[PDB]
Design an enzyme around this catalytic site. Structure first.
Site, PDB file in Angstrom:
ATOM      1  N   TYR B  28     -12.601   5.495  -7.092  1.00 25.89           N
ATOM      2  CA  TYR B  28     -11.855   6.497  -6.329  1.00 25.89           C
ATOM      3  C   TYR B  28     -10.675   7.117  -7.068  1.00 25.89           C
ATOM      4  O   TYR B  28     -10.137   6.555  -8.029  1.00 25.89           O
ATOM      5  CB  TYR B  28     -11.334   5.889  -5.020  1.00 25.89           C
ATOM      6  N   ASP B  39      -3.109   7.364  -7.059  1.00 28.69           N
ATOM      7  CA  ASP B  39      -3.831   6.221  -7.627  1.00 28.69           C
ATOM      8  C   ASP B  39      -5.260   6.589  -8.010  1.00 28.69           C
ATOM      9  O   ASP B  39      -5.888   7.428  -7.384  1.00 28.69           O
ATOM     10  CB  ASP B  39      -3.838   5.052  -6.630  1.00 28.69           C
ATOM     11  N   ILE B  58      -7.856   1.193   4.932  1.00 26.57           N
ATOM     12  CA  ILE B  58      -7.437   2.131   5.972  1.00 26.57           C
ATOM     13  C   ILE B  58      -8.642   2.660   6.747  1.00 26.57           C
ATOM     14  O   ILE B  58      -9.769   2.714   6.243  1.00 26.57           O
ATOM     15  CB  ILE B  58      -6.628   3.314   5.405  1.00 26.57           C
ATOM     16  N   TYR B  84      -1.859   5.876   6.558  1.00 25.69           N
ATOM     17  CA  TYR B  84      -0.671   5.020   6.620  1.00 25.69           C
ATOM     18  C   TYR B  84       0.339   5.452   7.674  1.00 25.69           C
ATOM     19  O   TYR B  84       1.418   4.874   7.766  1.00 25.69           O
ATOM     20  CB  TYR B  84      -0.003   4.951   5.247  1.00 25.69           C
TER      21      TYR B  84
END
Ligand SMILES: CO[C@H]1C[C@@H]2CC[C@@H](C)[C@@](O)(O2)C(=O)C(=O)N2CCCC[C@H]2C(=O)O[C@H]([C@H](C)C[C@@H]2CC[C@@H](O)[C@H](OC)C2)CC(=O)[C@H](C)/C=C(\C)[C@@H](O)[C@@H](OC)C(=O)[C@H](C)C[C@H](C)/C=C/C=C/C=C/1C
Lengths: 93, 110
Positions: B28, B39, B58, B84
Protein backbone atom coordinates in the site's frame (compact mmCIF):
# COMPACT_ATOMS: atom_id res chain seq x y z
CA UNK A 1 3.44 -17.72 30.64
CA UNK A 2 7.16 -18.12 31.30
CA UNK A 3 7.89 -18.82 27.63
CA UNK A 4 9.68 -15.91 25.98
CA UNK A 5 7.80 -16.28 22.69
CA UNK A 6 4.46 -16.14 24.51
CA UNK A 7 5.51 -13.30 26.78
CA UNK A 8 6.67 -11.22 23.80
CA UNK A 9 3.63 -12.17 21.68
CA UNK A 10 1.18 -10.99 24.34
CA UNK A 11 3.28 -7.95 25.23
CA UNK A 12 3.75 -6.71 21.68
CA UNK A 13 0.05 -7.01 20.96
CA UNK A 14 -0.93 -5.20 24.17
CA UNK A 15 1.75 -2.53 23.71
CA UNK A 16 0.42 -1.86 20.21
CA UNK A 17 -3.17 -1.68 21.50
CA UNK A 18 -2.12 0.91 24.05
CA UNK A 19 -0.14 2.95 21.53
CA UNK A 20 -2.34 2.78 18.41
CA UNK A 21 -5.66 2.15 20.12
CA UNK A 22 -5.51 4.15 23.36
CA UNK A 23 -2.94 6.70 22.14
CA UNK A 24 -1.09 5.92 25.33
CA UNK A 25 2.68 5.91 24.87
CA UNK A 26 3.36 5.91 28.62
CA UNK A 27 1.30 2.74 28.99
CA UNK A 28 2.96 1.18 25.95
CA UNK A 29 6.42 1.69 27.49
CA UNK A 30 5.32 0.16 30.79
CA UNK A 31 4.43 -3.04 28.92
CA UNK A 32 7.59 -3.14 26.78
CA UNK A 33 10.11 -2.06 29.45
CA UNK A 34 9.98 -5.31 31.52
CA UNK A 35 10.28 -7.41 28.40
CA UNK A 36 13.37 -5.55 27.17
CA UNK A 37 14.78 -5.73 30.72
CA UNK A 38 14.34 -9.50 30.58
CA UNK A 39 16.38 -9.59 27.36
CA UNK A 40 19.12 -7.48 28.96
CA UNK A 41 19.38 -10.02 31.80
CA UNK A 42 20.22 -12.58 29.09
CA UNK A 43 18.94 -16.04 28.17
CA UNK A 44 19.08 -18.70 30.89
CA UNK A 45 17.77 -21.78 29.05
CA UNK A 46 18.13 -23.54 25.69
CA UNK A 47 14.87 -22.10 24.41
CA UNK A 48 15.55 -18.58 25.72
CA UNK A 49 18.94 -18.78 23.99
CA UNK A 50 17.38 -19.84 20.67
CA UNK A 51 14.82 -17.04 20.96
CA UNK A 52 17.53 -14.48 21.69
CA UNK A 53 19.56 -15.70 18.70
CA UNK A 54 16.55 -15.27 16.40
CA UNK A 55 14.96 -12.07 17.71
CA UNK A 56 17.27 -10.38 20.19
CA UNK A 57 18.90 -8.05 17.67
CA UNK A 58 15.59 -6.99 16.11
CA UNK A 59 14.00 -6.35 19.51
CA UNK A 60 16.93 -4.29 20.79
CA UNK A 61 16.97 -2.27 17.54
CA UNK A 62 13.21 -1.67 17.82
CA UNK A 63 13.79 -0.17 21.26
CA UNK A 64 16.64 1.99 19.94
CA UNK A 65 14.51 3.40 17.12
CA UNK A 66 11.73 4.07 19.61
CA UNK A 67 14.09 5.96 21.92
CA UNK A 68 15.28 7.92 18.90
CA UNK A 69 11.66 8.73 18.05
CA UNK A 70 10.86 9.99 21.55
CA UNK A 71 13.45 12.75 21.01
CA UNK A 72 13.03 13.36 17.26
CA UNK A 73 9.27 13.13 16.78
CA UNK A 74 10.21 11.92 13.30
CA UNK A 75 7.64 9.49 11.88
CA UNK A 76 10.49 7.66 10.09
CA UNK A 77 11.94 6.58 13.45
CA UNK A 78 8.48 5.57 14.74
CA UNK A 79 7.76 3.45 11.77
CA UNK A 80 11.13 1.69 11.83
CA UNK A 81 10.52 0.79 15.47
CA UNK A 82 7.09 -0.68 14.79
CA UNK A 83 8.24 -2.46 11.63
CA UNK A 84 10.72 -4.39 13.77
CA UNK A 85 8.24 -5.16 16.56
CA UNK A 86 5.71 -6.26 13.88
CA UNK A 87 8.32 -8.45 12.25
CA UNK A 88 9.13 -10.26 15.51
CA UNK A 89 5.43 -10.55 16.35
CA UNK A 90 4.71 -12.20 12.99
CA UNK A 91 7.72 -14.56 13.08
CA UNK A 92 6.69 -15.87 16.52
CA UNK A 93 3.14 -15.95 15.08
CA UNK B 1 -23.88 3.69 2.97
CA UNK B 2 -20.28 2.45 2.99
CA UNK B 3 -18.04 5.33 4.07
CA UNK B 4 -15.36 4.68 1.46
CA UNK B 5 -15.22 4.63 -2.33
CA UNK B 6 -13.10 2.23 -4.38
CA UNK B 7 -11.66 2.66 -7.85
CA UNK B 8 -10.09 -0.39 -9.50
CA UNK B 9 -6.68 0.37 -11.04
CA UNK B 10 -5.85 -3.23 -11.98
CA UNK B 11 -8.31 -6.09 -11.96
CA UNK B 12 -7.78 -9.15 -9.77
CA UNK B 13 -8.73 -12.71 -10.70
CA UNK B 14 -12.44 -11.98 -10.09
CA UNK B 15 -12.65 -15.32 -8.30
CA UNK B 16 -10.86 -15.27 -4.97
CA UNK B 17 -12.13 -12.72 -2.44
CA UNK B 18 -11.08 -12.45 1.20
CA UNK B 19 -13.63 -13.70 3.73
CA UNK B 20 -14.04 -12.70 7.37
CA UNK B 21 -11.16 -14.25 9.29
CA UNK B 22 -8.84 -14.77 6.31
CA UNK B 23 -5.30 -13.47 6.45
CA UNK B 24 -4.60 -11.09 3.59
CA UNK B 25 -1.29 -9.72 2.32
CA UNK B 26 -1.11 -6.20 0.85
CA UNK B 27 1.15 -3.57 -0.64
CA UNK B 28 0.00 0.00 0.00
CA UNK B 29 0.68 3.71 -0.34
CA UNK B 30 -1.28 6.17 1.79
CA UNK B 31 -1.73 9.82 0.84
CA UNK B 32 -3.39 12.97 2.16
CA UNK B 33 -5.49 15.36 0.06
CA UNK B 34 -2.41 17.26 -1.18
CA UNK B 35 -0.69 14.03 -2.21
CA UNK B 36 1.58 13.90 0.83
CA UNK B 37 2.60 10.24 1.22
CA UNK B 38 2.15 9.55 4.93
CA UNK B 39 3.25 5.91 4.54
CA UNK B 40 4.10 3.17 2.08
CA UNK B 41 5.32 -0.37 2.71
CA UNK B 42 6.71 -0.56 -0.80
CA UNK B 43 10.54 -0.48 -0.80
CA UNK B 44 13.73 -5.68 3.63
CA UNK B 45 10.19 -4.74 2.57
CA UNK B 46 7.34 -7.25 2.71
CA UNK B 47 3.54 -7.14 2.39
CA UNK B 48 1.36 -6.08 5.30
CA UNK B 49 -0.53 -9.10 6.65
CA UNK B 50 -3.57 -9.19 8.91
CA UNK B 51 -6.73 -11.10 9.66
CA UNK B 52 -9.60 -9.36 7.90
CA UNK B 53 -12.94 -8.34 9.40
CA UNK B 54 -11.95 -8.35 13.07
CA UNK B 55 -10.77 -4.78 13.66
CA UNK B 56 -7.04 -5.24 13.07
CA UNK B 57 -7.14 -2.28 10.70
CA UNK B 58 -9.28 0.81 10.15
CA UNK B 59 -12.86 0.16 9.08
CA UNK B 60 -12.39 1.38 5.51
CA UNK B 61 -9.74 -1.29 4.93
CA UNK B 62 -11.61 -4.00 6.80
CA UNK B 63 -14.69 -3.47 4.64
CA UNK B 64 -13.01 -2.72 1.30
CA UNK B 65 -10.82 -5.83 1.31
CA UNK B 66 -13.87 -8.10 1.26
CA UNK B 67 -14.71 -6.60 -2.15
CA UNK B 68 -11.29 -7.10 -3.76
CA UNK B 69 -10.21 -10.21 -5.66
CA UNK B 70 -6.68 -11.56 -5.44
CA UNK B 71 -4.29 -9.45 -7.51
CA UNK B 72 -6.55 -6.42 -7.50
CA UNK B 73 -5.02 -2.98 -7.15
CA UNK B 74 -7.50 -0.33 -6.09
CA UNK B 75 -7.61 3.25 -4.91
CA UNK B 76 -9.59 3.65 -1.68
CA UNK B 77 -10.90 7.00 -0.50
CA UNK B 78 -11.86 6.57 3.13
CA UNK B 79 -13.99 9.02 5.09
CA UNK B 80 -12.63 10.00 8.49
CA UNK B 81 -15.40 8.12 10.33
CA UNK B 82 -13.97 4.86 8.90
CA UNK B 83 -10.35 5.91 9.39
CA UNK B 84 -8.97 7.85 12.36
CA UNK B 85 -11.92 10.16 12.99
CA UNK B 86 -11.75 13.23 15.22
CA UNK B 87 -8.43 12.39 16.88
CA UNK B 88 -6.57 11.54 13.70
CA UNK B 89 -3.08 10.06 14.16
CA UNK B 90 -0.87 13.05 15.04
CA UNK B 91 2.35 11.06 15.44
CA UNK B 92 1.92 9.84 11.86
CA UNK B 93 0.99 13.29 10.51
CA UNK B 94 -2.71 12.44 10.04
CA UNK B 95 -4.80 15.41 11.19
CA UNK B 96 -8.26 15.46 12.81
CA UNK B 97 -11.19 14.50 10.59
CA UNK B 98 -9.01 13.45 7.68
CA UNK B 99 -10.10 11.65 4.53
CA UNK B 100 -7.41 9.09 3.68
CA UNK B 101 -6.46 7.85 0.23
CA UNK B 102 -4.81 4.43 -0.16
CA UNK B 103 -3.57 2.53 -3.17
CA UNK B 104 -3.91 -1.08 -2.06
CA UNK B 105 -2.73 -4.20 -3.85
CA UNK B 106 -4.09 -7.51 -2.62
CA UNK B 107 -1.19 -9.93 -3.14
CA UNK B 108 -2.38 -13.09 -1.43
CA UNK B 109 -5.05 -14.70 0.76
CA UNK B 110 -3.91 -17.42 3.18
C1 LIG C 1 5.31 0.31 10.75
O1 LIG C 1 4.08 0.73 10.14
C2 LIG C 1 2.97 0.56 11.02
C3 LIG C 1 1.70 0.95 10.29
C4 LIG C 1 1.51 2.44 10.07
C5 LIG C 1 1.10 3.13 11.37
C6 LIG C 1 0.60 4.54 11.08
C7 LIG C 1 -0.46 4.55 9.98
C8 LIG C 1 -0.85 5.99 9.65
C9 LIG C 1 0.05 3.81 8.75
O2 LIG C 1 1.17 4.51 8.22
O3 LIG C 1 0.42 2.51 9.15
C10 LIG C 1 -1.00 3.57 7.69
O4 LIG C 1 -0.70 3.72 6.51
C11 LIG C 1 -2.35 3.13 8.04
O5 LIG C 1 -3.20 3.97 8.30
N1 LIG C 1 -2.61 1.81 8.01
C12 LIG C 1 -1.63 0.73 7.80
C13 LIG C 1 -2.12 -0.18 6.68
C14 LIG C 1 -3.51 -0.73 6.97
C15 LIG C 1 -4.45 0.45 7.13
C16 LIG C 1 -4.00 1.37 8.27
C17 LIG C 1 -4.18 0.73 9.61
O6 LIG C 1 -5.26 0.27 9.98
O7 LIG C 1 -3.04 0.66 10.50
C18 LIG C 1 -3.30 0.12 11.79
C19 LIG C 1 -3.66 1.28 12.72
C20 LIG C 1 -2.56 2.35 12.74
C21 LIG C 1 -3.97 0.89 14.17
C22 LIG C 1 -5.16 -0.07 14.33
C23 LIG C 1 -6.40 0.45 13.62
C24 LIG C 1 -7.62 -0.43 13.91
C25 LIG C 1 -7.89 -0.49 15.41
O8 LIG C 1 -9.02 -1.34 15.68
C26 LIG C 1 -6.66 -1.02 16.16
O9 LIG C 1 -6.91 -0.90 17.56
C27 LIG C 1 -6.17 -1.86 18.31
C28 LIG C 1 -5.43 -0.19 15.84
C29 LIG C 1 -2.01 -0.56 12.23
C30 LIG C 1 -1.82 -1.91 11.58
O10 LIG C 1 -2.22 -2.12 10.44
C31 LIG C 1 -1.16 -3.00 12.39
C32 LIG C 1 -0.64 -4.10 11.48
C33 LIG C 1 -2.22 -3.54 13.33
C34 LIG C 1 -2.26 -3.22 14.63
C35 LIG C 1 -1.24 -2.29 15.24
C36 LIG C 1 -3.35 -3.75 15.51
O11 LIG C 1 -4.23 -4.58 14.76
C37 LIG C 1 -2.83 -4.53 16.72
O12 LIG C 1 -3.95 -4.71 17.59
C38 LIG C 1 -3.62 -4.56 18.97
C39 LIG C 1 -2.33 -5.88 16.29
O13 LIG C 1 -3.03 -6.87 16.46
C40 LIG C 1 -0.98 -6.02 15.66
C41 LIG C 1 -1.03 -7.12 14.61
C42 LIG C 1 0.02 -6.32 16.79
C43 LIG C 1 1.46 -6.10 16.36
C44 LIG C 1 2.40 -6.45 17.51
C45 LIG C 1 1.65 -4.65 15.96
C46 LIG C 1 2.08 -4.35 14.73
C47 LIG C 1 2.26 -2.95 14.32
C48 LIG C 1 2.46 -2.66 13.03
C49 LIG C 1 2.63 -1.27 12.63
C50 LIG C 1 2.83 -0.90 11.35
C51 LIG C 1 2.90 -1.91 10.23
Amino acid sequence: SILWHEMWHEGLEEASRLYFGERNVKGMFEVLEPLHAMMERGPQTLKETSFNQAYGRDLMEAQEWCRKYMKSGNVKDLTQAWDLYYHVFRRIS
Amino acid sequence: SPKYTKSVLKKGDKTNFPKKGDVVHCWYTGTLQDGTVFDTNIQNAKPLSFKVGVGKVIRGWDEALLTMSKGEKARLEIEPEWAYGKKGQPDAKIPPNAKLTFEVELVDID
